[model samples]
Target: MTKKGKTLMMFVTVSGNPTEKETEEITSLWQGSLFNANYDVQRFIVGSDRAIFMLRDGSYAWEIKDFLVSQDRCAEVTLEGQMYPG
Candidate 1:
């Protein structure tokens, strides 16, 4: 199946909880990369290094993932399926 321009659901883990500027930059990048559609970007923290992100569009996460695992200490990411609220 296709995984793009739809539900933004995923659980990610970093070696440790990230800092403020780190994640803010993530959003900065997320929004910066977009050319047409604009949506809300909200990320809620779970455990120390686990976090859940909410937003539309798929590439954003992959883009964010690149930075996380590349620069930050992130390793793995597991999708939790599409989450559409009613």
Candidate 2:
């Protein structure tokens, strides 16, 4: 059996308040084939329009951030533990 390592957590934020349809569209990006193959959302905060995800690889966070920016829906996507000293 193969063992998997721990994944890093991320915090996402959209630019403006989104409508229901827009939210669905944004969510689809994660569940879609492009990302579903690797990343997994560990926790989602619907009330605050935030989410926490577990990425297959820590470096993949950059890819995800780029994707969000490309969509034009998100203003920022921040990753936790980046500045932490080992």
Candidate 3:
């Protein structure tokens, strides 16, 4: 089988209470992206408001410096280098 790995930079926020389903959905979305890149998968939770991706010799980190920068009303996105391990 081909080893698939993808690195993603993500920023998001949740209010009130968070549910298992919501969490699963977020994970599923990320996985879908990773699947396309053929990544094995690994995640790093930087803090309550941040997360980073660890995949195949590359890394991605998300910060809440400016939450709405993405026009998503949820987060500001900063995509890392094109290919970390390339």
Model 2 clash tally, residue pairs = 0
Q: What is the TM-score of each candidate against the true structure?
A: 0.48, 0.59, 0.35
For all candidates, what are the clash counts?
A: 0, 0, 4
* Per-candidate local distance difference test: 0.53, 0.58, 0.41
- Superior by lDDT: candidate 1 or candidate 3: 1
Model 1 scores worst on lDDT over the 10 consecutive residues at 77-86
Tens-digit lDDT track of model 1 for 1-86: 87656667666555545665565555345445432345445666665556676656665665545444454355465645522110
- How do these models rank on TM-score, best leading? 2, 1, 3
RMSD of each: 8.0, 6.0, 9.6
How big is the positional error of residue 52 in model 1, measured in Å on the Cα after superposition?
Answer: 0.7
- Ordered by lDDT, highest first, the candidates read 2, 1, 3
> Model 2: per-residue lDDT, tens digit, 1-86?
95567577676655477665565567566547435655554545453455455565766767666665565666556776452111
- What local lDDT score does residue 21 receive in model 1, on the 0 to 100 scale? 56
Off by more than 4 A, model 2: 1-4, 19-24, 36-43, 81-86
Runs in model 1 lying further than 4 Å from the true structure = 1-5, 16-40, 79-86
